[PDB]
Amino acid sequence: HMTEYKLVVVGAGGVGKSALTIQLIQNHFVDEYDPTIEDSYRKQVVIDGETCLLDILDTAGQEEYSAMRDQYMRTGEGFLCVFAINNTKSFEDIHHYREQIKRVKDSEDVPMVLVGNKCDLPSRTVDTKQAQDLARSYGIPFIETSAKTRQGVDDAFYTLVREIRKHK
Amino acid sequence: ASNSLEIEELARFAVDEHNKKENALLEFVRVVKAKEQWHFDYQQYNTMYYLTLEAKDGGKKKLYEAKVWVKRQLRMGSMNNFKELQEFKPV
Ligand SMILES: Nc1nc2c(ncn2[C@@H]2O[C@H](COP(=O)(O)OP(=O)(O)O)[C@@H](O)[C@H]2O)c(=O)[nH]1
Ligand SMILES: [Mg+2]
């Protein structure tokens, strides 16, 4: 009797899309997952009493041809847009990831969470305020995560599911 | 997953919080009715729970209405969780 939620993880190479996704699926930090590999996962999880099946695509890029990525981008219900708090370029790229989602969904109001990953690091270049301001301007929630420590991982995915519910 | 709570967990919380506030010894049996009303705002995923539950009071099964308020709020990149028993009264 599971409610299916189709989720897509997007963001620049190296931000931690694979590490975040694998923390949710396998409950440990996998710190060297091939940066070119895309894979989907089916996670059975109870969220707020709802038995959910999260159908999650971990994307590896948006340029190389992928029938599977195109299908998930077109029919995906919610998107994690991930940058790294020590990588200003990854944060500047967020605009382009959001624009692609709005274009393929033909909607201004797509369920999304802005995720500032690697919040374990001392080497912050993107201030929490800077990220929160961008998210607020988009009308999307913002959370800081560490795939390394698993900080914020469950809350990022649960927040995306709650964003999809608001919109369904 | 600390802010992902089931109706039963919120009913046990209500009984435990009542027992603490009023120095009572109600023993939770089961939930009879539940209404959950979600309240959404920017970075707010809040819920009012209207619970009818059965608890043993001095060896006698009685019905109670409880209201539990749950706040799940993102502030400066961090999830903030809050739960409070708002009301607990016999039916
Ligand atoms: N310090 C730190 N490093 C991370 C974190 N998440 C991922 N990494 C590292 O960042 C690099 C890229 O992670 P990966 O998950 O492959 O990124 P992807 O290209 O977005 O899939 C790897 O060296 C990971 O070990 C994190 O939360 N903290
Ligand atoms: Mg990857």
**In angstroms, rounded to a whole number, what is the distance separating the alpha carbons of residues A30 and A15?**
13
Which residue owns the Cα nearest ligand 1 atom 7? A16
Atom of ligand 1 nearest to the CA of A22: 15
Helix, strand, coil shares of chain B, percent, nearest 5, are 20, 65, 20
**In angstroms, rounded to a whole number, what is the distance separating the alpha carbons of residues A93 and B25?**
57
Taking each helix axis from N to C end, the angle separating A153-167 and A17-26, rounded to the nearest 10 degrees, works out to 90
Pairing of strands B60-75, A50-58: unpaired
Q: How far, in Å, from the CA of A26 to the mean position of ligand 2?
A: 15
Tokens at B87, concatenated: 């009301």
Burial of A65 (0-12, 13-18, 19+ CB in 10 A): exposed
Q: Is A61 annotated as a binding residue?
A: yes
Phi, psi torsion values for A24, nearest 5 degrees: -65, -40
Cβ neighbors of A148 (< 8 A, separation 6 or more) are A19, A29, A31, A118, A120
CB contacts, 8 Å: A152 with chain B: 77-79
**In angstroms, rounded to a whole number, what is the distance separating the alpha carbons of residues A22 and B9?**
28
Tokens at A48, concatenated: 């707020």
CA neighbor of A151 nearest in space, from B4, B46, B76, B79:
B79
Q: Is A77 annotated as a binding residue?
A: no
User: What Rg do the C-alpha atoms of chain A give, in angstroms?
Assistant: 15
Pocket test for ligand 1, best of A17, A29, A31 (most atoms within 8 A of CB): A31
What domain count does chain B have?
1
CB contacts, 8 Å: A144 with chain B: 77-78
Tokens at A9, concatenated: 């993880």
**In angstroms, rounded to a whole number, what is the distance separating the alpha carbons of residues A97 and A83?**
10
Residue type, A70: D
Give the three-class secondary structure for A122: coil
CB contacts, 8 Å: A158 with chain B: 1, 3-4
Resolution (A): 1.8
Which residues on adjacent β-strands are paired with residue A146?
A151
**In angstroms, rounded to a whole number, what is the distance separating the alpha carbons of residues B82 and B70?**
6
CA distance readout (Å), A148 to A145, A152, B21:
9, 11, 41
**In angstroms, rounded to a whole number, what is the distance separating the alpha carbons of residues A160 and A45?**
13
User: What Rg do the C-alpha atoms of chain B give, in angstroms?
Assistant: 14
CB B73 within 8 A of CB B80: yes
**A122 at interface of B, judged by CB pairs closer than 8 A:** no
Residue span of the structural domain in which B91 resides:
1-91
CA neighbor of A116 nearest in space, from A73, A151, A161:
A151
Which domains can be identified in chain A, with CATH numbers?
A: 3-166 (3.40.50.300)
Q: How far, in Å, from the CA of A80 to the mean position of ligand 1?
A: 15
- Other beta carbons within 10 angstroms of residue B1's beta carbon come to 12
Pocket test for ligand 1, best of A10, A18, A39, A56 (most atoms within 8 A of CB): A18
Tokens at A98, concatenated: 């959001």
Place of tokens 């219900």: A77
